[PDB]
Amino acid sequence: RRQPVTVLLKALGWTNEQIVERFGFSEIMMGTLEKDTTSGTDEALLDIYRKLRPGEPPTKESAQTLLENLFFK
Amino acid sequence: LSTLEAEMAVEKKAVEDQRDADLEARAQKLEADLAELEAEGAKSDVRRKVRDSGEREMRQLRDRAQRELDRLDEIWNTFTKLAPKQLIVDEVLYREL
Amino acid sequence: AKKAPAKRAAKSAAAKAADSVRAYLKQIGKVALLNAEEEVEL
After folding, report:
1. What function does the entry list (chain B)?
2. Which among A48, A49, B5, B54 could bridge B30 via Cys, Cβ 3.0 to 4.6 Å?
3. What is the C-alpha separation between A2 and B13, in angstroms, rounded?
4. How many CB atoms neighbour CB A46 within 10 A?
5. What does DSSP assign to residue C9?
């Protein structure tokens, strides 16, 4: 729990303007990114990494492949 | 407690002296290098990216010295307030204690 | 990534935190692999 849907949309590497571009008519789509404090796409992967794999200090090689391997792979 | 605090102060100071010594050397190096950059005709944005890179390498040196100053303060605070039933999860800290 | 590498220091937040084998792997990971010269030394 405690996971905003916006923090992951940035985890793919999409910049916020894309959120404002794709979200559009969605008001809570902007307010969720407006409330979310995650700055950067790699920092959001880290907030996702410690919630998904608690106990293991991550690596930029492991932080990126985690999301890719989980679903897309 | 007296001799311990006294040995901790010197230790924390020795780290401080070093941070200063190291930080002034990296600054003079950047002064020397921005000097050659003006000696030759050098694009303005190139002279600033040398300072930007040089400024950032300094923040690293200070941050690292700060980390050790905090690690040392954590050691001393922990040991002075130390009481039975307290829990120590660091184990690198615990080893230092 | 100069301010990101300081965020990669969240690896420190991980070393402070369910499975028993995960627990044992965390600790054996803290040591460092020797090369041929050190093995002889030891």
Report:
1. DNA-dependent RNA polymerase catalyzes the transcription of DNA into RNA using the four ribonucleoside triphosphates as substrates.
2. B54
3. 43
4. 23
5. G
User: Which residues does chain C have within 8 Å of residue A46's beta carbon, measured at their own beta carbons?
Assistant: 7-8, 10
Distance of alpha carbon A25 from alpha carbon A73, whole angstroms:
32
Please state, in angstroms and rounded to a whole number, the distance separating the CA atoms of residues B35 and B63. 27
Residue of B nearest to C5 (CA): B60
Query: Which residues on chain C are in Cβ contact (under 8 Å) with A59?
Result: 11
Structure-token match 């990101």, residue found: C4
Cβ atoms of C2 and B61 closer than 8 Å: no
Q: A26 vs chain C: nearest CA distance in angstroms?
A: 30
Contact A57 C11 (CB under 8 A): yes
Give the pair of three-digit tokens for residue B37. 């950059």
